[PDB]
Design a protein around this ligand. Structure first.
Ligand SMILES: [Co+2]
Ligand code: NA
Ligand code: NA
Ligand code: NA
Ligand code: NA
Ligand code: NA
Ligand code: NA
Length: 480
């Protein structure tokens, strides 16, 4: 159990702009905490001469991040009256009341005070902190219980009184509880002190976003696949479970032997041995030659089972898959959510904002693209006619099957294109600060590694669920 008390100074010395800027920090914090699957109870208070309680931890809805964010969004600077006075002591007493009781010992409390430190009314606020520690039994028995209280003070504005701010904040070794609101480095560090990374290692679609992170931290699911032959093959894939990596089927052939295939993940120097490659049963690159389709990429997906089981860390984590309980939670939806509901959320009938990862000279970079899933879909699919060897295709819909998603082009925006080395990699949608894989990079019209018909096709994972569900049934992913 965790309670977070957001206390915002709305006095005259703060000003409208900085007050709004301060709320932004709070909105972003609530969102990041939620993205970790953590559900604390929130308290929300604004103050000047007197405090105004907007949300109390005792309220049932106080643990509903969307509802709290809504409340915070509705708060207007002018709502808090009597701005000529600043009584920080009273603001903290409002928090004390929320902790008061007219398994308390298991609740951890976090106070986040945003002020310039210029209280001009009431006594010394430090006194209330002392009452709070006594109330929560902290610093009483050396069972110190210091872990149960954290007082963060974010200095707002250019004219801040550092002494008063330092006085109220917690003082814990190897930790920082004071930050200037504009100091983005400091604020960032605060988050990682507050939330326990360990409780979220089993979460799919998670990324450690800290400024010190590497390419492996920013794309933890990314797997590099090597096939040594004839020329050597280079493909990308995504970790979907402790034993499996999802990639494209065309990256391999029935002639490739297990030992000739190596996988690399997490920025580790070593390569990983595979047990076997599971091609989608319906994949047959030569199945439509008669129809004028030299290479048929329908059902172009394959699952690589690794010899050794992976352990999830900050550089090796699974991406979320469509229609699984993991994705439902990542999207913060109720347990009664359906595959169709997930589909409507992730792949609506319109231009969908998405991304894929590309290796550009030892470095991984995200490329933003748009999935044409609206009435712009046909135009994208038809451009498949300009693809090499597809000039004599009778019905283009026979090559561009219902299994494909389409990206690339100049509308609505100039989309970047996938390169040969990106083949097999995941096509991703970013939602609720989480990453969900909706497709597998399959093939393109033009090798641009540009023309308006330079489209890229990906296998829609929603269209191969029966197979995914079957091959991953024992991976504890909880398919719906
Ligand atoms: Co003031
Ligand atoms: Na709401
Ligand atoms: Na003690
Ligand atoms: Na950890
Ligand atoms: Na480390
Ligand atoms: Na669920
Ligand atoms: Na679909």
């Amino acid at each position: 159990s965790m309670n977070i008390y957001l206390v915002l100074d709305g006095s005259d010395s703060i000003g409208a702009s900085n007050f709004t800027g301060a709320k932004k920090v709070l909105v972003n914090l609530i969102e990041k905490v939620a993205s970790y699957g953590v559900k604390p109870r929130y308290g929300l208070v604004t103050y000047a001469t007197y405090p105004k309680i907007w949300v109390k931890v005792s309220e049932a809805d106080s643990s509903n991040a969307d509802w709290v964010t809504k409340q915070l969004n509705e708060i207007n600077y002018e709502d808090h009256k009597l701005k000529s006075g600043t009584n920080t002591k009273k603001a903290l007493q409002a928090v004390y009341s929320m902790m008061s009781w007219p398994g308390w010992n298991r609740t951890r409390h976090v106070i986040i005070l945003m002020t310039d430190g210029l209280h001009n009314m009431g006594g010394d606020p430090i006194t209330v902190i002392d009452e709070i520690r006594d109330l929560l039994y902290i610093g009483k028995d050396r069972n110190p219980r210091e872990d149960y209280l954290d007082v963060y003070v974010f200095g707002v504005g250019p004219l801040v009184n550092q002494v008063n701010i330092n006085a109220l904040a917690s003082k814990k070794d190897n930790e920082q509880h004071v930050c200037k609101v504009k100091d983005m480095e400091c604020l960032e560090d605060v988050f990682y002190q507050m939330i326990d990374e360990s409780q979220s290692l089993s979460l799919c679609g998670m990324v450690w976003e800290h400024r010190k992170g590497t390419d492996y931290h920013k794309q933890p699911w990314q797997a590099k696949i090597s096939v040594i032959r004839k020329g050597h093959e280079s493909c990308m894939g995504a970790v979907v479970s402790e034993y499996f990596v999802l990639t494209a089927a065309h990256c391999f052939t029935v002639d490739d032997k297990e030992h000739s295939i190596k996988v690399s993940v997490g920025g580790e120097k070593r390569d990983l041995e595979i047990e076997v490659v599971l091609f989608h049963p319906n994949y047959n690159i030569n199945g439509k030659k008669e129809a004028g389709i030299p290479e048929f990429y329908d059902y172009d997906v394959a699952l690589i089972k690794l010899k050794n089981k992976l352990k999830y860390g900050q550089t090796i984590r699974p991406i979320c898959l469509p229609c699984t309980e993991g994705t439902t939670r990542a999207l913060r939806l109720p347990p009664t959510t359906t595959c169709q509901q997930q589909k409507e959320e992730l792949l609506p009938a319109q231009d969908i904002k998405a991304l894929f990862v590309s290796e550009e000279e030892k470095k991984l970079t995200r490329k933003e693209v748009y999935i044409k899933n609206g009435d712009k879909k046909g135009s994208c699919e038809r451009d498949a006619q300009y693809a090499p060897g597809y000039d004599k295709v009778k019905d283009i819909s026979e090559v561009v099957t219902p299994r494909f998603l389409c990206t690339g082009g100049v509308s609505p925006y100039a989309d970047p294109n996938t390169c040969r080395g990106d083949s097999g990699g995941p096509l991703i949608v970013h939602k609720r600060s989480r990453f969900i894989q909706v497709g597998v990079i399959s093939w393109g019209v033009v090798d641009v590694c540009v023309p308006a018909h330079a489209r890229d096709f990906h296998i829609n994972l929603f269209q191969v669920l029966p197979w995914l569900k079957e091959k991953l049934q024992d991976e504890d992913l909880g398919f719906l």
